[PDB]
Symmetry: D2
Subunit: 394 residues, 4 copies
């Protein structure tokens, strides 16, 4: 307001498949890759960064404060504080919102915010300190334990998606249609080169030598409803299920970042931003239907912006599950041709801590490419939250 | 400033010994205990909380977003967002600073901030997804991997303490003197009932039934230099070492929380706060000497407050290691009778994510009890950071 | 027959409680202790041993061929072959029977046979070579998996004991009476010094220095039916159960050995044996009632010896469970004052691979002490086998 | 002698590659496959078996007495005892020798002996009962710990092979020549159908349905010295090494069995045996050079038979390593055209507990096919043993 926070640069790694192209890359190196790149793009020297704030969910085995490792590994000096936030799938967007606060209140001048996740490298967990006299002990999967199981109902996120499918009357067929659309949109965007600008290559050391990875790995080209219709429901297997691996997001690896500063600071520095941040919201809802978090979050953020829903040109609403995506669109009455137009996480994947920033990166570049003005990024969050941000092209 | 953020209530659990009195209590239940209690103390209804922000470091195996579990378990409704921050040992104080920002900028009205850690429940970690054809695989200790090993130099925090002992010329004898002083101060504070007000009991289900735990477990009463002088250095064993288990903080379990709002909101509600928050700082330093983080952090925060160091009545500077505590005091020229006067983490323990809020809780209650005005809380942070806050009794 | 196999010396370690006095002693060192000792007792030089044959059940993590480690560690030269047999609880007696065959057929002149088990050191097991994409994996307890669970019915040995209790009509009260009797007999034998001769001390390296362990650890002195009557059934918990920890054998650590040669060789060497081996048997029965294996085994061995059951002066029948012990006695019509007169495994413990030789050692020394002539040793075996041996004092 | 023990039938599974074609088949099912088949081949009813004796080394996680599981799973009644022997790589031949003793002394009439191993299914091991306060714990590979590491020198079997290569002056080039010869011989034998008779197919349940596996998986067709010459030494990496994966046996899965009875019993039953057993030996040597065990074992067995080495038509000497094979041949002065003429374990693989019987099976069928008379089977054994058997075609 008058001197709003603006986003000057925005980049992401490709999103790797589970146990795929980025699996050997430590999360902090994904982070360093995007941090160094957005600073390069913005022509901001690393010593001028006030702080680094990253979302990161599955941090077991990553060492002490992996965000600080990422910062230093990007060339940011030890003098610059760096820290993480966790708000499950909202984390990478929450990082951006935190930067908005720190800049807006006058504590920070330039913030690199983002998110990062290497789910392939998430470990299994054993509790060994008591010592089991006699009997089996579990090696628990941290992805399931800490990432994907609701704490209140002890059910997978996909069961919450089934809850939303039932309550919002999103059929199996509806879900597969949304999934095929997401796949086809991503394939089209890829062929057209729409992600070239946002992607920064990742260097991977291989037996055959160092290679660059610069194409998203998760999309299933030639996706079709006939093939999707044949799959069995994965999460709910009692004959009433609807969610399958083809209409759900994946488990994936990736990172994304943005450079933020006040408009006045961008002006001082001769930088034209991608967009100004208009508003943001965080909300709470019931855990059993966490997927609908974006409904109140978007409504609140749009209201705070002084907008109507019709004023929004482009939405990125994270595609946790087709059932959930469809419910949000249906309830809000959104035009599908304005929502996830480059495809979403069904096709692209969902590295938990990264996605909230990844979708913002894609949004900003879509607004830019299409010469549209107003955008919204929003995500649901396990345990019953939502987060949303309104941006306007500058 | 004019309408500053104020702290209305401040409470903590006891600090449990490693594999001790709180070992069976999930971290989120420690969190719920303090959250519910500070709201009770402040006479603030849980539905009036804007958000909950907690520090938490070792989150493996704790389930989806343990801070949200803690919030809901305290009686805060699902409508209230709850999330975590990680900045290693600074996390619990960072949570408070984040609340200052959210309130100060106008996003939140009332925040419950704090920190929590159950180190006893930290798991061991195994990477199982590739699958080892042939050979040994480690079960890595998450406390060592993620909590206590510097990422840049692959050394324990205690080696960084040895680095500081050498550079700031803090002898073995100096360190044991500081440690005995800390022990004796805590024992005196305990006997005098100085922690009664701040402590909230924890309920623990036992075979013999439910019991309340309301005394700190870690202090070693009757500590003396003769006994401490006999121990061997633990971290550096080549004959030049100085840090032992008796002059280092412990591995421990606990939680702490505070209720924050604007002065105007406290006034509206007829609440007299414990203190107003004057300033805070976060800084970066070299990882090899991370222990000295508080030197620049305190200097910056005190300067921001418009104070001189002599104006500060009481300091809580987390006692990660006696070597580090002594170095900070020596460099800054502080009066030991103004620093950690109820004892510190050598005696009381150091649950990573909780300590930054725990020391603030103890500080506020010391200012209150002694009728003193100005306080500073500060911590070092692994990877080379410092964080500090200035408060003034209201 | 004419030139029978004879046993010249017989010794055992104490039996350690689970995670108790012998828990830090590798199984092969228990073996070495008894092997070296029976050779000393027999005045047979280690280079004169033909081969070493030991029972051993739970060999995971013990290294390559632990019996060879035990042999060499006892001072037997590398020129002497050493190997193991596994027949679950029968293993230590089977080793002796194998020695009878090798000597009797003329392949070996002098054999050290025995059994050994360190159950405390049995590891947990994880299958890691495929690599689990996503999901929990068990750390399986090798004692349960490989030692104590029937392969055919996937039930604990204690469920087979319940099967026998039901079919042979051995009540809870009957079982506790047998258990108290076993405890009291062992306590009496201990007080009277009856085990002094057979026991060889084990050296254990301790922080406080090296100590000798020379008392059995498992007995519960002052055992009584009032206390036993209060315990709940452990294995079968649906209200029809009868087997509890107080009327079942333990999980334990120990080793035992014997030196065998032909009578003519003992005569040549001027050695008076403890006894001659008269006969032995191995049999199969239904796995669900494996505990009754000794009924056919004893009958067959006694028949092979040309004896009647009344001719047998002393029986050692391993006390896997009181239910099983009682069933054998009842079916065969044995005099309880001739069966397990020094107590049995309820009081003394049951290191799987050792027990078959341990009971033989105790039998031989009881015959000797009491100046009685004919003895039988017998055990049940998981999966439905029995093994028995008839001996006669020489 | 006069009424010798004879072998009536002899069969084996294919040998599967590590984590290959048999990896999903429990070891006991491999055992059942061969046991049922040799009884079928011999036209001996399962109820007429006296006992079953199998070699088996890596038994962790296989359940209670896997040999009894194999026996029952083959259709042998519960009345028939079944048990295992362990003498590392000698185990499967030791089982046969034990059967010779039991039959020869008159205890058993018909024995099914053999060996079995599923190395793919060998677990990793963790010691969890004490409980590690703080620090890493290993998941130890049972194959390395229990199978392949010498207990006396803490070195791999391949280091013992390097010891033998040095002492017996077997160069890298010598070793690769032996390895190529083994590969080529096996490839020739395969093409010619020489293993068709001995192999019994294994049924494997697959997603695509049940399939039969009937070809050995490990051979490397088209093996050549140019390719082998390029590989680096695997075990000894200081520049003096010679043993590589191409001149060493593999880690593998398989089982083998034989049916034994007296000649008089075969005559009674109208069965023509494959061969009579003439003699056998077991010996001990130094662990550092365990590979040379067969030298004294073969010499002793041949002497016991009343033979000269020139009288032996065909040798199977297990190819643990080319270095070791070559040393034995060189020292004994054997004709290579009489040794391992169908190839050996370099090409075929080495399932530890199975190999001692597997080579006997192959030997018997080679004698039969070629119409030759006298054979020797021999193996080295970790920890410094050797075992050998002389057979003569009947
Ligand atoms: C569902 C999940 C476990 C993946 O399961 P998986 O068994 O590895 O799934 P795969 O990728 O192997 O796919 C399974 C099948 O679906 C098929 N499939 C997936 N996408 C398809 C597509 N677009 N078209 C056709 N078939 C497809 C695969 O080909 C495979 O078929 P197959 O069995 O014949 O080989 C994982 O993606 C998941 O948990 N997603 C949700 C993550 C989550 O909850 N995030 C938080 C959101 S709040
Ligand atoms: C050092 C550490 C590993 C504990 O080690 P430990 O071996 O469990 O230490 P213990 O509590 O068993 O104490 C070890 C010995 O010191 C003795 N000791 C400890 N405190 C003592 C005291 N005040 N007076 C006398 N002796 C004391 C104990 O009695 C014990 O003696 P013992 O060997 O005779 O039994 C752990 O406390 C630690 O790592 N602390 C640092 C945590 C950290 O780095 N936090 C982050 C900071 S940046
Ligand atoms: C049963 C078993 C699991 C031990 O269980 P556990 O829970 O460790 O048993 P404990 O030794 O702790 O004893 C449990 C209780 O019984 C009590 N108890 C045991 N022996 C007793 C005795 N003689 N008098 C009174 N109480 C006794 C203990 O005091 C303990 O009481 P508590 O709960 O108040 O502390 C184990 O001994 C076992 O599995 N045995 C069978 C082994 C086997 O099957 N071998 C193969 C045979 S075929
Ligand atoms: C050596 C051992 C660890 C296998 O190691 P590994 O790394 O899995 O070996 P691989 O089968 O992957 O072969 C390694 C390389 O050798 C090559 N190689 C193996 N056999 C070859 C052949 N006949 N011709 C050409 N190359 C060959 C493989 O192609 C592979 O080449 P690559 O690196 O380019 O892919 C294992 O076989 C072993 O330990 N053997 C000994 C077992 C033992 O000691 N038994 C007890 C005896 S006392």
């Amino acid at each position: 307001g008058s001197d709003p926070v603006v986003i000057v640069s925005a980049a992401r790694t490709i999103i790797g498949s589970f146990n795929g192209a980025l699996a050997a890359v430590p999360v902090q190196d994904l982070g360093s890759t995007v941090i160094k790149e957005v600073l390069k793009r913005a022509t901001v020297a690393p010593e001028d960064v006030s702080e680094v704030i990253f979302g990161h969910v599955l941090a077991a085995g990553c060492g002490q404060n992996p965000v600080r490792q990422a910062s230093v590994g990007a060339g940011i000096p030890y003098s610059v504080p760096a820290w993480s936030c966790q708000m499950i799938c909202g984390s990478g967007l929450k990082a951006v919102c935190l930067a908005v606060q720190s800049i807006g209140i006058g504590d920070s001048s330039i913030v690199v915010a983002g998110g990062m996740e290497n789910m392939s490298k998430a470990p299994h967990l054993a509790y060994l300190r008591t010592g089991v006299k006699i009997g089996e002990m579990p090696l628990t999967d941290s992805i399931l334990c800490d990432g994907l199981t609701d704490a209140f109902h002890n059910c997978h996120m996909g069961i919450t998606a089934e809850n939303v499918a039932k309550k919002w009357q999103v059929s199996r067929e509806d879900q597969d249609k949304v999934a095929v659309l997401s796949q086809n949109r991503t394939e089209n965007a890829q062929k057209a080169g729409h992600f070239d600008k946002e992607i920064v290559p990742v260097l991977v050391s291989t037996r055959k030598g160092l290679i660059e990875v610069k194409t998203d790995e998760f999309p299933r080209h030639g996706s079709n409803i006939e093939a999707m219709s044949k799959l069995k429901p994965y999460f709910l297997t009692d004959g009433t299920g609807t969610v399958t691996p083809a209409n759900a997001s994946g488990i994936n690896d990736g990172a994304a970042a943005v450079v933020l500063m006040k408009k006045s600071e961008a002006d001082k520095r001769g930088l034209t931003p991608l967009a100004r941040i208009v508003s943001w919201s965080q909300v709470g809802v019931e855990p059993s239907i966490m997927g609908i978090g974006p409904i109140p979050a978007i409504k609140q953020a749009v209201t705070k912006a002084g907008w109507s829903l019709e004023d929004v040109d482009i939405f990125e609403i994270n595609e946790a599950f087709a059932a959930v995506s469809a419910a949000i669109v249906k309830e809000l009455g959104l035009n599908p041709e304005k929502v996830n137009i480059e495809g979403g996480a069904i096709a692209l994947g969902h590295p938990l801590g990264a996605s909230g920033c990844r979708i913002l990166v894609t949004l900003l570049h879509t607004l830019e490419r299409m010469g549209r003005s107003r955008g919204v990024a929003a995500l649901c969050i396990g345990g019953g939250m939502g987060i949303a941000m309104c941006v306007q092209r500058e």
